[PDB]
Amino acid sequence: MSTYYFVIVGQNDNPIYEKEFSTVNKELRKEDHRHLTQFIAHAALDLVDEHKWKTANMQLKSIDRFNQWFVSAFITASQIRFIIVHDNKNDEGIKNFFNEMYDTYIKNSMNAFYRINTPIKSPMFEKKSEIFGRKYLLS
């Protein structure tokens, strides 16, 4: 299995919103791993900058490695970074799964209340995250 974990990196590089998709265990250690993965979000940020300057497409398969984790990076026209840390990859579905969370994030965009890198608070997006994660990643 893969301990899927999603994280948002904003336009101004500050993190925004996470969402676990892992099995239930080691949650106290998972707090330290959450600190770790925010740091990995910054490291991704840094690498995927030049790597997205290498390309012009939406998905950059997987960039960083830490001897157990895989880091999968998604870049948008919103230049947001959507990141998954996961022991074994599931990329083939998450390409369009990122596309669908992209569409939902657009839905939040039309909500002018949600604004530039303004941290997520709506229950709508949280329940969308729950249902989508139970769909593919958390499964």
Partner: protein, 164 residues
């Protein structure tokens, strides 16, 4: 419709004029609102027109924005997109149709700038979220034009990419 949007936007402008005691930062409010709309205009129009495809080439992304945003917002794509060779940071997008004067506007005696600044702020938000931060200024040069000033960092990344 057109009257509803033209008016309602006019009340945005004049209510800002209420909260604002002078021309320039009134225009700044217009810019900020243009930003707050473009900040989603960008990635809406991404999927439905750009076919969810990113354009790293400043020319291609800028041209496609020129087509798309004007095609859907105000129907007619802006007439011309030009790059100034003296200053590669500073290009122009001339739109002969004034989107302010679509709703025929105030005498520019007591004031200078208008909804032109609002759509300029839209353009600026689109640029800065496309990974090309820029300064977009409405200018009454050859009618309505938007001067775009690229960050030396952004135009430098571009020039380095423009080393095939």
């Amino acid at each position: 419709s057109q009257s509803i949007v033209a008016l309602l936007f006019s009340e945005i402008v004049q209510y800002s004029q209420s909260r604002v005691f002078t021309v320039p930062e009134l225009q700044t409010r217009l810019h900020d609102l243009g930003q707050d709309v473009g900040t989603r205009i960008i990635d809406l129009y991404f999927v439905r027109e750009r076919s969810s495809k990113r354009e790293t080439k400043l020319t291609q992304m800028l041209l496609f924005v020129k087509t798309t945003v004007w095609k859907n917002l105000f129907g007619k794509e802006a007439e011309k997109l030009e790059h100034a060779n003296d200053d590669e940071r500073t290009y122009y997008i001339i739109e002969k149709e004034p989107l302010v004067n679509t709703f025929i506007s105030v005498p520019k005696d007591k004031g200078s700038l208008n909804c032109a600044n609002f759509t300029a702020g839209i353009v600026e938000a689109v640029l800065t979220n496309c990974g090309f931060p820029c300064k977009v200024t409405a200018h009454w040069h050859k009618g309505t034009t938007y001067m775009v000033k690229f960050e030396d960092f952004v135009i430098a990344r571009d020039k380095q990419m423009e080393e095939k």
